[PDB]
Amino acid sequence: KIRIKLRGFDHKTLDASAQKIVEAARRSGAQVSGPIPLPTRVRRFTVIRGPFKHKDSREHFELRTHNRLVDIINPNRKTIEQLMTLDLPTGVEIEIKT
Amino acid sequence: GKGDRRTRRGKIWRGTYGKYRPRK
Amino acid sequence: PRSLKKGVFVDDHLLEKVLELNAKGEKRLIKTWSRRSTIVPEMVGHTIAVYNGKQHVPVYITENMVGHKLGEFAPTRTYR
Amino acid sequence: ARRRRAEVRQLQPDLVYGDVLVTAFINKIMRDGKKNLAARIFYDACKIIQEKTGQEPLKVFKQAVENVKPRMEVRSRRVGGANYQVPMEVSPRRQQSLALRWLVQAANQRPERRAAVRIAHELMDAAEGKGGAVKKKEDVERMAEANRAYAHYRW
Amino acid sequence: ARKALIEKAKRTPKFKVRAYTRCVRCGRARSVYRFFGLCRICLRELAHKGQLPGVRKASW
Amino acid sequence: EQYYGTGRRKEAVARVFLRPGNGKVTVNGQDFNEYFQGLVRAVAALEPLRAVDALGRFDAYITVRGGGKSGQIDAIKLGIARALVQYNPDYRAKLKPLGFLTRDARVVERKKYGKHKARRAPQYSKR
Amino acid sequence: GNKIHPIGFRLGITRDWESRWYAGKKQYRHLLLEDQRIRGLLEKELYSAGLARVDIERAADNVAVTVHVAKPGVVIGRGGERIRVLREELAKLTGKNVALNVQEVQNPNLSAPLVAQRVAEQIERRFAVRRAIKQAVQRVMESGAKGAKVIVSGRIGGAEQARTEWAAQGRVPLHTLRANIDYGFALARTTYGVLGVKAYIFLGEV
Amino acid sequence: ARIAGVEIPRNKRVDVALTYIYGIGKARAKEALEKTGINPATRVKDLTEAEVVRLREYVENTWKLEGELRAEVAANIKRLMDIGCYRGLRHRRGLPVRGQRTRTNARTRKGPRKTVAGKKKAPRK
RNA sequence: CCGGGCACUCUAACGGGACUGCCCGCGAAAGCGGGAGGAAGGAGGGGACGACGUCUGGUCAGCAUGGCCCUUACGGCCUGGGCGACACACGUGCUACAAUGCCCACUACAAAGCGAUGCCACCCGGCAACGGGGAGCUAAUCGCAAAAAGGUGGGCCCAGUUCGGAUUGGGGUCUGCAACCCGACCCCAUGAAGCCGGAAUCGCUAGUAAUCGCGGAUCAGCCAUGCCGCGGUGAAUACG
Ligand SMILES: [K+]
Ligand SMILES: [K+]
Ligand SMILES: [K+]
Ligand SMILES: [Mg+2]
Ligand SMILES: [Mg+2]
Ligand SMILES: [Mg+2]
Ligand SMILES: [Mg+2]
Ligand SMILES: [Mg+2]
Ligand SMILES: [Mg+2]
Ligand SMILES: [Mg+2]
Ligand SMILES: [Mg+2]
Ligand SMILES: [Mg+2]
Ligand SMILES: [Mg+2]
Ligand SMILES: [Mg+2]
Ligand SMILES: [Mg+2]
Ligand SMILES: [Mg+2]
Ligand SMILES: [Mg+2]
Ligand SMILES: [Mg+2]
Ligand SMILES: [Mg+2]
Ligand SMILES: [Mg+2]
Ligand SMILES: [Mg+2]
Ligand SMILES: [Mg+2]
Ligand SMILES: [Mg+2]
Ligand SMILES: [Mg+2]
Ligand SMILES: [Mg+2]
Ligand SMILES: [Mg+2]
Ligand SMILES: [Mg+2]
Ligand SMILES: [Mg+2]
Ligand SMILES: [Mg+2]
Ligand SMILES: [Mg+2]
Ligand SMILES: [Zn+2]
């Protein structure tokens, strides 16, 4: 019962990086609950394009926070070896909950 | 109408609650 | 349809300056900038010079004009 | 339509008569997108043309329409500075368009409070030959032709 | 945006209802976002540069 | 046994299951006519059957979510004809001519800036 | 007054961010004011080095701060005498035990910001504008490249009436995403006001 | 029936007909009828001498209505007008008293428009 | 809800698919007009993208900047006032003038978003705004949240009306150091113009217009009927 959520801005890293944790267990743990998607929380920013006036232009910006699950049922004691300090991502965050 | 504080629509439109539009 | 709640606001600048004039009979005039303050009984029979934003307007406070606020008697703008 | 020649969109047949000419009239009766509300008015009126008449509504409908189709009208034009009302025929597509519109317009001009009644009552007076829908029509025609002196301006 | 007014940072308002965001990058005090501490202008600029992680050009 | 089809419209999905029987239809539990109370529309959703003269040979268990009751009515219209095809592929030949097999792509067009709502533009005064 | 930023227009594609790191609505702004302040000092300092880019990565109180330079020499300093000062001067501003690489730019003539700075300098040096531009494009267009372009703002040669000189070679298809055009702006302070140099270098394709 | 001060509502549901009384609105109408048990839906013509009387009683005693209100309201306006009170000044000058703009539309309080001359260029638009 | 299953729906990564490829007619080609097969057919819808340049266009009050100018002040602090004034005129809007409508009941179907010192279920006091107490959320897991138009039932019967809710008395709740000038929000009483708008003039060609409601940024609160998005229902017409 290892719940590890994966939240980031890059759906490629937070994705590859996410499939890093998946194999570092498929060699020492339950078939795992596989990598679960989980809706993305988009944040939009809308601003008048130029300074002073011209209120009818505006440009649209969004901050896409992607998410993941993974989740390794069966608290395998041999998995924490491959899943201890064998990471590589740079813009990813990880939450661990048992 | 959407402008009568004391109607169902009045409340909704003005996005409030009260006697004329209770919170469930 | 006015309001405020439970605690009737008044600035102690002149409060502890209006009652302080009572523990000595009375006085004459009081220069104030706080029109935010609610007129209460211990003022009845006084003369509070409120500020427009330009000058101080004498304001003989009376019985009825209690619940009101000092500013209500110091007209801000000037018109035709 | 500066480029091609615009294709007349095809409507969905009636759910109670499998008629397109009905859906058409129903759309004209329609207000702010509320079709359900519209539809009712129609059928409810069809039921009223049912009671007050042994004839089926669908038939009363068709006839009501048919009588209000104008076959001539006057469109304007600029010549020498003055304006002339040139009488010209009226294509099938337009005849229909003006009919259904005129009915509904004449209908809602009626005195009876209930909608479905007015549509029913106008529809009846229509097939009968009377009614303001037909008056509007006969008028467009009186207008046209009554300028035959300008007909030599074939559109 | 006179320096004397970029004192906002005070946090010594005497009455907290006097506090007011104010862009950290241009001193802007009129269209300052919370999530960035940047005004609508500054936000547009750095966003284009790519100095705001994740922040991409939204389209749909 | 039973046959499946999906069906989506104006952003609303429908789960369709067709089983031989009278002609009863369970939409989200409630009987069809219960769910689609007085909506002159509804009636259409079962059109795929009238097409191949079925109806009186099938029962239908339908689920539906997202959108509005009229969008769903069209979604139901798809599943019914999509399942009805899996059941018997020879049925496509009669459904296509009336295209019940097509997915209506018309969807709420996005709102643009500067415009009051996509296309509807603001009103300019004495230019 | 049109045309979007070539970088901002190509972030998700041919061009990555200059700051990679996730944060929450509570720290994002902070990890920005700072993350920005990092670029503030490094820019004023590592000027002569000719710093093209200043990537910055983060983690649990960690920092990358890879500084890209043409002449890494001035960076590091005598044996290591400087890359130490400016790391202790760095971590002083932000107590985060910050790393600090020093990458080297292979051919600074394909580094739009540099090319811009170059032209910018020459302008403060009372040089002839049109020349620098023509040269710049050449230097860049010669160091390989499938296209290049430079634009100096206005008030050319202190001329009362501002103008806009540019000239370019090869391709600079600003409309195609699948391109990769390093863009670089460089200001140019003077005795008669500012000038703005802009540089484009069409490198790759797909 | 004649409830409050010579008020003669009729041929209409009592609840709504009651409304024709000065100080009586949709709310109080609903009240009085209930706290007197009288189907609101009964036309006034169809009330009862009994019901009517009960109604007349409650209303005229449970509240300050008609002419008495008017005099009272006018009294208050008059009141806060005798003070150097700002609101009072607005009443005197005949302008809105609840902090509304007067640069444009403040008609309902000002009445009809008393148009005048002005400039032409500098698009007053 | 349990068990436990991923098949569906969905979530979100990655791919498949459309090419005038196939069929007939025209053509010299390019490419037309039709047909089949297909979810989709000839840029399938909608975005981001706006050339050399033109208005000596806009912005020195976002910022940057050359040159003038002030320096016990044209710099700085504060309390208070003013940006909210009102004989008038215009732009953009909101709410309407009603029966295809307005109320009150009861019931059904959305999407996007937002939520630490914040969404706030539930319970209790109060007509209510709101107040107490208090579960859950660190958020596909809890909350905002009722979608509304719709449907079923009942009332109103054509009246300035059960239309419309301006204005004005009252009595209150909140935020906030503080609501006189100058805040929303309840509740009672008021219940104004308005019967569809002259000359003129605006938008929109399809999930568009029209109509209904929902969210967010900014933000203590709010004067948002603004703005940027969201999804329900869903037309008319285009000869030319
Ligand atoms: K309406
Ligand atoms: K110019
Ligand atoms: K009025
Ligand atoms: Mg009303
Ligand atoms: Mg207080
Ligand atoms: Mg309807
Ligand atoms: Mg400054
Ligand atoms: Mg504030
Ligand atoms: Mg601010
Ligand atoms: Mg819409
Ligand atoms: Mg470009
Ligand atoms: Mg009354
Ligand atoms: Mg005012
Ligand atoms: Mg060919
Ligand atoms: Mg293009
Ligand atoms: Mg000029
Ligand atoms: Mg101009
Ligand atoms: Mg200019
Ligand atoms: Mg203003
Ligand atoms: Mg409107
Ligand atoms: Mg109507
Ligand atoms: Mg309660
Ligand atoms: Mg209670
Ligand atoms: Mg105030
Ligand atoms: Mg009327
Ligand atoms: Mg068009
Ligand atoms: Mg809103
Ligand atoms: Mg707000
Ligand atoms: Mg206001
Ligand atoms: Mg609002
Ligand atoms: Zn800023």
Curated annotation (Swiss-Prot), chain A:
One GO BP annotation of this record: translation
GO molecular function, one term: rRNA binding
Gene3D superfamilies according to UniProt: Ribosomal protein S10 domain
Superkingdom field: Bacteria
Sequence intervals crossing the membrane: none
Keywords from the named record: Ribonucleoprotein, Ribosomal protein, RNA-binding, rRNA-binding
SUPFAM superfamilies, alphabetized: Ribosomal protein S10
Entry keyword annotation includes RNA-binding: yes
Gene Ontology cellular-component terms listed: ribonucleoprotein complex; ribosome
Pfam (any one): Ribosomal_S10
PANTHER family, per the entry: 30S RIBOSOMAL PROTEIN S10 FAMILY MEMBER
Similarity annotation: Belongs to the universal ribosomal protein uS10 family.
Primary role: Involved in the binding of tRNA to the ribosomes. Part of the top of the 30S subunit head.
Known partners and oligomeric status: Part of the 30S ribosomal subunit. Forms a tight complex with proteins S3 and S14. Also contacts protein S9.
Name of the protein in its database record: Small ribosomal subunit protein uS10
Species annotation: Thermus thermophilus (strain ATCC 27634 / DSM 579 / HB8)
Lineage of the species this protein comes from: Bacteria, Thermotogati, Deinococcota, Deinococci, Thermales
Swiss-Prot record, chain B:
InterPro entries associated with the record: Ribosomal_bTHX, Ribosomal_bTHX/bTHXc/bTHXm
Region (Disordered): 1-24
Biased composition range(s): Basic residues: 1-12
Gene Ontology CC terms: ribonucleoprotein complex; ribosome
Molecular function (Gene Ontology), one example: rRNA binding
Keywords: Ribonucleoprotein, Ribosomal protein, RNA-binding, rRNA-binding
Subunit structure as annotated in this protein's UniProt entry: Part of the 30S ribosomal subunit.
Stated role: Binds at the top of the head of the 30S subunit. It stabilizes a number of different RNA elements and thus is important for subunit structure.
Recorded family membership: Belongs to the bacterial ribosomal protein bTHX family.
Protein name per the record: Small ribosomal subunit protein bTHX
Lineage of producing organism: Bacteria, Thermotogati, Deinococcota, Deinococci, Thermales
Gene this protein is translated from: rpsU
From Swiss-Prot, chain D:
Sample GO molecular function, one term: tRNA binding
Pfam families: Ribosomal_S7 (PF00177)
Origin: domain of life: Bacteria
UniProt keyword annotation of Ligase present: no
InterPro entries recorded: Ribosomal_uS7, Ribosomal_uS7_bac/org-type, Ribosomal_uS7_CS, Ribosomal_uS7_dom, Ribosomal_uS7_dom_sf
Gene Ontology terms: biological process: translation
Keyword line: Ribonucleoprotein, Ribosomal protein, RNA-binding, rRNA-binding, tRNA-binding
A cellular component annotation (GO) from this entry: small ribosomal subunit
Recorded family membership: Belongs to the universal ribosomal protein uS7 family.
Role summary: One of the primary rRNA binding proteins, it binds directly to 3'-end of the 16S rRNA where it nucleates assembly of the head domain of the 30S subunit. Is located at the subunit interface close to the decoding center. Binds mRNA and the E site tRNA blocking its exit path in the ribosome. This blockage implies that this section of the ribosome must be able to move to release the deacetylated tRNA.
Subunit (UniProt): Part of the 30S ribosomal subunit. Contacts proteins S9 and S11. Binds to the C-terminus of IF3 and to the C-terminus of Era.
PANTHER family: RIBOSOMAL PROTEIN S7
Protein name per UniProt: Small ribosomal subunit protein uS7
Organism of provenance: Thermus thermophilus (strain ATCC 27634 / DSM 579 / HB8)
This protein's encoding gene: rpsG
Swiss-Prot record, chain E:
HAMAP family attached to this UniProt entry: Ribosomal_uS14_2_B (MF_01364_B)
Pfam families: Ribosomal_S14 (PF00253)
Keywords associated with the record: Metal-binding, Ribonucleoprotein, Ribosomal protein, RNA-binding, rRNA-binding, Zinc
GO CC terms of this entry: cytoplasm; small ribosomal subunit
GO MF term list: rRNA binding; structural constituent of ribosome; zinc ion binding
Gene3D superfamilies given in the database record: 30s Ribosomal Protein S14, Chain N
Name recorded for this polypeptide: Small ribosomal subunit protein uS14
CC cofactor: Zn(2+)
InterPro entries in alphabetical order: Ribosomal_uS14, Ribosomal_uS14_bact, Ribosomal_uS14_CS, Ribosomal_uS14_sf
Cofactor, how bound (note): Binds 1 zinc ion per subunit.
Keyword Ribosomal protein: yes
NCBIfam families named in the record: PRK08061.1 (NF005974)
Keyword Magnesium found: no
Superkingdom per UniProt: Bacteria
The protein's role, per its UniProt record: Required for the assembly of 30S particles and may also be responsible for determining the conformation of the 16S rRNA at the A site. Binds 16S rRNA in center of the 30S subunit head.
SUBUNIT field: Part of the 30S ribosomal subunit. Forms a tight complex with proteins S3 and S10, which cover it.
UniProt similarity note: Belongs to the universal ribosomal protein uS14 family. Zinc-binding uS14 subfamily.
UniProt record, GO biological process: translation
